[PDB]
Design a protein around this nucleic acid. Structure first.
Ligand code: ZN
Lengths: 121, 177, 51, 72, 93, 107, 193
RNA sequence: AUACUUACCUUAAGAUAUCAGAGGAGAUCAAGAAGUCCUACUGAUCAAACAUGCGCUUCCAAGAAGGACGUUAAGCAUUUAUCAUUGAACGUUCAUUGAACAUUGAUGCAAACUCCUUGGUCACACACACGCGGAAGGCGUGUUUGCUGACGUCCCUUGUUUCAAUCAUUGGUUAACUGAUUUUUGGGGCCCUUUGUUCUUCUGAGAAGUGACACCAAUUGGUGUUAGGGGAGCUGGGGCCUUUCAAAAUUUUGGAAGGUCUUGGUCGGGUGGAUCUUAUAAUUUUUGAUUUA
């Protein structure tokens, strides 16, 4: 997929990436992680869940693989029944764009606190 | 310990189940809540796409057509009209079959909204606490309304029409009332 | 194998690991030498110690 | 830490699905912070029936879910 | 305390969620009240057994540690829980 | 006394990992979490001779075309069954545990 | 519907009910780990077929610190067995000695007299020094002539324990090298305050 | 907004680099604890941010990547569409009684069309070998801090680009010439999906502003936006050159200063948050009941 994932990044740095998290069942969830926690409960935006069927599993044995996708959208997956997560797509907006966006979010937040201080007066 | 309510921008000094339930049912929370969710949707619908639109590089361009701009007052007016009309088209449903089956033997079990058994126990349970001061149900049978055209019902309502094309109707209907 | 460390959880470092199991379908017993291992105590059922 | 919200089901006939095919119907006499559940008049339903004595208590690990058979 | 995802599950109260269970059962219905321990209580529940049937519970209470995931509605994509920078209005004293 | 700290001394070291499933994983540790969520860049991972759930969990992780070559795999702690260290590494150096030493001086 | 009508109807407008078909996992009856578990007693042969044991050497590195701690404590106890024979201590009454410590270095002995003559006539005074540096260590031993002004010098309200001798607060005790039953100095695990 | 009443609730703990010395806490017993603790002390490693490089490495225009929760499509092949009891006829068929999605499906194999979203459809050039600014990662150097941040500059333009003419200023050469910059006029190209014909408002490009504007509910409450480019001043970093001083054997290294180029910017706290320890390896996510025996 030649995506070249950041060699020194873990979960909090992986935010808004498009993941391919894999579970104990062998089902795959694909989508933007928007949040995790201590127990690895993930949210997953626009998520699609794919299985292989039992029948297509025979072809998977030691190729074109009719994976079955249902569309779960905004789901919020659990840390108990997962196995492992990888990264599939990079996010939409680049590091400069994410950086300028975070600057604007912080300026707006400081401004809202100034407005709270004004209404408190 | 502290439960920050992101909508109310207030705190709960010590989290427990009962102050959470009583806060999330609280009318102040519901009002700021509804304002926020409406607000996010009207922002996302308002927010223009503004794609990059990577312009390619290209004889047969001989025809030239006139663009049509508008005045800034005219822009703001037609945008306001479109806002009101989107808000109508989303909200409006179609009555008809309520008004059609008005006299029916089992209208008052089926369309009267919580006598249906399926959604029925909801609307009793979804009723809000009525702490401030100030139904046609299953009892209705056939012999309640024996003969509907004795006691005059209103006619079937005349169908609705786009005002943009209201000028182009058949003038002078056959058969005056 | 010989044990290098202990855990509350019985996470165990093992050195010069012999491991050996049984493929039952007939049977081929397969063995593998793994010299430096870190084994989680969840899989560990029973620790027997020879004198 | 939080005790579960089975207060609405306090006397109403509930149906646990226990473990994946065990289905037990009783009346919810009790609950603790682990969803250990004390049922009265447990009557295990196989798809044949089997009654399960006067009182019973069922492990909140084994319990998957429970339905209110009685109206609320 | 909670952390972001179970706070989201505390947010999506009274709205149409869909749960898979570990058995493969995917309950679907309105979400009466979730707890912090992810025990979630649901209403007007339409259930899909592993065998492929469908039935209708009225009033289910599925335990948290057999939830496979839960799907909330789409709009909570845009939620103030996700805002990384919203500053705190002077915590109580 | 926990041994995850042992693994925390092992950033940029090349191990294999056998999972409770049966998946075998080859590729360096970039870090390790408190409860042993081990993140691993430059993986190629294999499944020895078979488990159908493991077959699905192998293929579906992209770049299968049964060695699957992946840039970056986070692995959850309760999936890691056993982890094979490099034999070049000296265990006498690592198990010394400066925290356990300080606690001996704390006593 | 829920409490407010507008966004519950329009905005949230949730997901389609979702398509189901056949799972891959096992439908509870067989979730098993491994009921066919090993029968270890065969392997008691194969360890003979396994046949030295490598040096642990890290527990040795901790055991060196533990053994050094016990050896230093034992050298302490050897200094504990090894104060009537001592020539610095004068064989006066222990009840008429007052100990002072936390003393400034440049404090002259005549000043020590001057702060101490207020209560009783002083018999003799030994301020303790290093024997190799000859810096004043910071503690001294006073015997008065009576016990009662040693006790009034021990009773401290407005006086000694808290007096600022050469711009520093000092500490003022009865001598416990002779008096109390179990006393060890700082070198011997004891000491006060 | 204020008052009154009711209901509910009021504190898990600790740490924030690590190791070794300098000094302190100048250690309450006859010269001394050992240890442990702190630090604008120093030294070493590590982590994070920022800057710079790497003649780093890879990816960037009818097609390529991804998707269709679309069709052709009942395309073709295969399979399946309850049990129990009783009666009758020769295991089957029919009838009665009792109990509990879908065949146009499902599964497999493809194949084609149509559609969708994204991307430097860049600059240069269109030719006979064996370029700058983008996006993602790796390494190196330097600074700063040992968690983070909260609480207690000016001017021009915003359709752009190119060409000619006029005028102003400045430099050089002998009033003439050449070059640079600014203004105006005109033409050509590209683009106007800028879909509301453009940071916000107003008018049909111009004008004003940088608390205001926009909008949904009932003056109040909520969310978003306040931009982009260029230049100058100043500041940070890197590279080169020159001078001086020191050290080592004309050369190397380090520091300072000046010039040129390139890139970037314009003390406290019962506060919270983040990370890591400890409760916490016992039913709810991390100390295993998902290799199906
Ligand atoms: Zn609130």
């Amino acid at each position: 997929s030649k995506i070249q994932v950041a060699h020194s990044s873990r979960l909090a740095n992986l935010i808004d990436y498009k993941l391919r998290v894999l579970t104990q069942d062998g089902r795959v969830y694909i989508g933007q992680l928007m949040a995790f926690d201590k127990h690895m409960n993930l949210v997953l935006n626009e998520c699609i869940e794919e299985r292989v069927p039992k029948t297509q599993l025979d072809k998977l044995r030691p190729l074109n693989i009719k994976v079955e996708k249902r569309v779960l959208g905004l789901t919020i997956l659990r840390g108990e029944q997962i196995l492992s997560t990888v990264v599939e797509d990079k996010p939409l907006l680049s590091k400069k764009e994410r950086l300028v966006r975070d600057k604007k979010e912080k300026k707006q937040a400081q401004k809202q606190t100034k407005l709270r201080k004004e209404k408190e007066k | 310990t502290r439960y920050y309510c992101e909508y109310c921008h207030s705190y709960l000094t010590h989290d427990t189940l009962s102050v959470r339930k009583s806060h999330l049912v609280g009318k102040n929370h519901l009002r700021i809540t509804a304002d926020y969710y409406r607000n996010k949707a009207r922002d996302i619908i308002n927010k223009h796409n503004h794609k990059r639109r990577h312009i390619g590089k290209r004889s047969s361009q001989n025809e030239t057509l006139k663009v049509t701009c508008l005045s800034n007052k005219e822009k703001r007016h037609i945008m306001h009209v479109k806002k009101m009309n989107q808000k109508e088209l989303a909200q409006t449903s179609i009555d008809t079959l309520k008004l059609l089956y008005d006299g029916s033997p089992g209208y008052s079990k089926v369309f009267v909204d919580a006598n249906r058994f399926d959604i029925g126990d909801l609307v009793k349970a979804s009723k809000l606490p009525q702490r401030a001061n100030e139904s046609r149900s299953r009892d209705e049978t056939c012999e309640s309304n024996p003969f509907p055209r004795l006691n005059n019902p209103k006619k079937l309502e005349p169908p609705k029409i786009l005002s943009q094309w209201s000028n182009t109707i058949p003038k002078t209907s056959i058969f005056y009332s | 194998a010989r044990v290098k460390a202990f855990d509350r959880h019985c996470n165990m470092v093992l050195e010069n690991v012999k491991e050996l199991w049984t493929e039952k379908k007939n049977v081929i017993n397969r063995e593998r030498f793994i010299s430096k291992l870190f084994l989680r105590g969840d899989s560990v059922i029973v620790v027997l110690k020879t004198p | 830490v939080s005790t579960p919200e089975l207060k609405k089901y306090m006397d109403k006939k509930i149906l646990l699905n226990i473990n994946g095919s065990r289905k037990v119907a009783g009346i919810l006499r009790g609950y603790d912070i682990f969803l250990n559940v004390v049922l009265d008049d447990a009557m295990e339903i196989n798809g044949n029936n089997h009654q399960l004595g006067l009182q019973t208590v069922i492990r909140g690990n084994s319990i998957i879910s429970l339905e209110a058979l009685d109206a609320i | 305390m909670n952390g972001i995802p179970v706070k989201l599950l505390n947010e999506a109260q009274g709205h149409i969620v869909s749960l898979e269970l570990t058995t493969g059962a995917t309950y679907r219905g309105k979400l009466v009240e979730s707890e912090d321990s992810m025990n979630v209580q649901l209403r007007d529940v339409i259930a899909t057994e592993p065998q492929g049937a469908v039935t209708h519970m009225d009033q289910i209470f599925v335990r948290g540690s057999q939830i496979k995931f839960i799907v909330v509605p789409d709009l909570l994509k845009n939620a103030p829980l996700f805002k990384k920078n919203s500053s705190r209005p002077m915590p109580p004293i | 006394m926990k041994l995850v700290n042992f693994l925390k001394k092992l950033r940029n070291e090349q191990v294999t990992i056998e999972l409770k499933n049966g998946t075998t994983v080859w590729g360096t540790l970039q870090s390790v979490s408190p409860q042993m969520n081990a993140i691993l860049t430059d993986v190629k991972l294999t499944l020895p001779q078979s488990n159908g759930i493991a077959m699905a969990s192998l293929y579906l992780t992209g770049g299968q075309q049964n060695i699957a070559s992946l840039q970056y795999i986070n692995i959850r702690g309760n999936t890691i069954r056993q982890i094979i260290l490099p034999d070049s590494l000296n265990l006498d150096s690592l198990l010394v545990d400066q925290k356990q030493l300080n606690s001996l001086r704390r006593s | 519907l829920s409490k407010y009508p507008d966004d519950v109807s329009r905005l949230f407008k949730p997901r389609p009910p979702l398509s189901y078909k056949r799972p891959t996992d096992y439908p509870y009856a067989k979730r098993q780990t491994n009921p066919n578990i090993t029968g270890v007693a065969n392997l008691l042969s194969t360890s003979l077929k396994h046949y030295x044991x490598x040096x642990x050497x890290x527990x040795x590195x901790x055991x060196x610190x533990x053994x050094x701690x016990x050896x230093x404590x034992x050298x302490x106890x050897x200094x504990x067995x090894x104060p009537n024979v001592d020539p610095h201590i004068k064989d006066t009454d222990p009840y008429r000695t007052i100990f002072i410590g936390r003393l400034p270095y440049d404090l002259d002995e005549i000043e020590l007299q001057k702060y101490f003559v207020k209560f009783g006539e002083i018999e003799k005074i030994r301020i303790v020094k290093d024997k190799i540096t000859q810096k004043s260590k910071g503690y001294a031993f006073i015997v008065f002539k009576d016990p009662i002004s040693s006790k009034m010098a021990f009773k401290e309200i407005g006086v000694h324990r808290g007096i600022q001798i050469k711009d520093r607060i000092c500490i003022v005790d009865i001598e416990r090298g002779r008096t109390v039953k179990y006393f060890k100095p700082r070198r011997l695990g004891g000491g006060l305050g």
